[PDB]
Structure formats: structure tokens, C-alpha cells
């Protein structure tokens, strides 16, 4: 089995200089990217960038872009966030995921279970509702939208409390292995949605969508999906 770990978070003073690991196992470790995707306490997601395979070139965000340095060692089969003058907004949990070896696959497979960090012009994704309560048995439908057209390269993970996200779907419509039937999804262009005909317990999670048409990789802000009694009023925002 895939296994991803990350290590070296610790709390650290605003102004120092920390890095990160992704021990990586159970695969061949040069076929795959690696990427870093950090969270914000009771925030999204936010991609921090990724190495490559086969050309090992890193790609950032803008928004850490010339600050943080991603590396690769293929003889230790760990990739390395190194984060530099520290402050406030990179109080996160951080994560490195696998990107599968395609060329238009930059979505994540795999992801560690994260180290937390605490300091003492793209394509934006918008999701609705941010907030929504439903019941068990439901049909619940959330809607992703692209502020322009991505083809079908949309992704989406059902995120649980203190658990990394897990991809759900891919491709706007390619169901992941080991992801049940009451999930679907649909689209192209700029409207994307993803549906679960019927609501079991372990179904009451955050769903974020993601974007891979274009660099930067871009997360929406998140839909997060709360339990209600059948008797209760039905609410989403």
C-alpha cells in the first residue's frame, strides 16, 4: 500500500526557516509528482506547489512563489517543503499528495495525514453552498463553478474531521476506486456538480472541488455537509 508521511512540524517563531518531509513508500517513487497543499485551522485548501516526474521541474503558487523551495531525493524517496521567513497566514496543516503519472492528471490520489505549522489571474473556484444541513436518506446536489473553462479537469474530496481529504472524483464524472455508487458527478466547461442520491452517516463531510486545467492548481472554498433530523427543517447557505 501507498503510504505518504509528513514530518519536521513543530511551533515556530514568526521570521524562521523550517522544513517539511514526505517520506513516500509502497510505489515507484520516480513515476509520480509530489505536491504540498496546506489548510488554515477551520480554512481550505491552498496548493503550495509540486515536482514533476521525469523532468523533476518544481511548479509554485504564486502566493508562495520565491519564498518556499519544493525539493525531491529519489534515494531517500522523500520530497522537502522548505518554508522561509514564517509568519501568521502559514499557521496550516501541511500536506504533500501524489499526482498520478499523466501529463493532464493533477489531481490527488494519495495524501500523508499532515504535519501542523504553528507560528506563535487564477482560475478561481467557486463553491455553493458553503454550508448546507441535510438529512440521512437524501438526494443532496453541490454545485462547483469555474470563473472560466477548465474543459472536464475538475476533481473533488470529501475531507472528514482530522483526516486529509480523500479524492472522490476526477475527470468531472470518473468515479475513484473504493468510492461507493451514491456518488456522481457532472459537467464541462465552467459548471460542474457533484451529486450523493442518498446520504449515509460517514457521507457528513466537507467537499472541496479542484481545478487542473491551468497552473495554479485552485481549490473551491469548500461545502460543508451538516446532519439534521428528518423532523428538522431542511437549511444551506
Known amino acids: 500500500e501507498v503510504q505518504l508521511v509528513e514530518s519536521g512540524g513543530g511551533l515556530v517563531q514568526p521570521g524562521q526557516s523550517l522544513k517539511l518531509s514526505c517520506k513516500a513508500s509502497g510505489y515507484t517513487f520516480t513515476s509520480y509528482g509530489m505536491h504540498w497543499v496546506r489548510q ?29 523551495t519544493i525539493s525531491r531525493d529519489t534515494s531517500k524517496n522523500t520530497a522537502y517543503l522548505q518554508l522561509n521567513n514564517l509568519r501568521a497566514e502559514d499557521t496550516a496543516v501541511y500536506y504533500c499528495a501524489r499526482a498520478p503519472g499523466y501529463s493532464n492528471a493533477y489531481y490527488f490520489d494519495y495524501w500523508g495525514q499532515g504535519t501542523l505549522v504553528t507560528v506563535s489571474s487564477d482560475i478561481q473556484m467557486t463553491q455553493s ?109
Open 129 to 237: 453552498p458553503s454550508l448546507l444541513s441535510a438529512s440521512l436518506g437524501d438526494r443532496v446536489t453541490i454545485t462547483c463553478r469555474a470563473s472560466e473553462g477548465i474543459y472536464h479537469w475538475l476533481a473533488w474530496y470529501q475531507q472528514k474531521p482530522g483526516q486529509s481529504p480523500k479524492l472522490l472524483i476526477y475527470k468531472a464524472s470518473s468515479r475513484a476506486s473504493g468510492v461507493p455508487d451514491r456518488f456522481s458527478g457532472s459537467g464541462s466547461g465552467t459548471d460542474f456538480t457533484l451529486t450523493i442520491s442518498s446520504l449515509e452517516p460517514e457521507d457528513f463531510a466537507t467537499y472541496y472541488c479542484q481545478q487542473y486545467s491551468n497552473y495554479p492548481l485552485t481549490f473551491g472554498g469548500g461545502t460543508k455537509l451538516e446532519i439534521k433530523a428528518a423532523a428538522e427543517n431542511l437549511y444551506f447557505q
Open 40 to 68: 488554515a485551522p477551520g480554512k481550505g485548501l491552498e496548493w503550495m506547489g509540486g515536482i514533476i516526474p521525469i523532468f523533476g521541474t518544481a511548479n509554485y503558487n504564486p502566493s508562495v512563489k520565491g519564498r518556499f
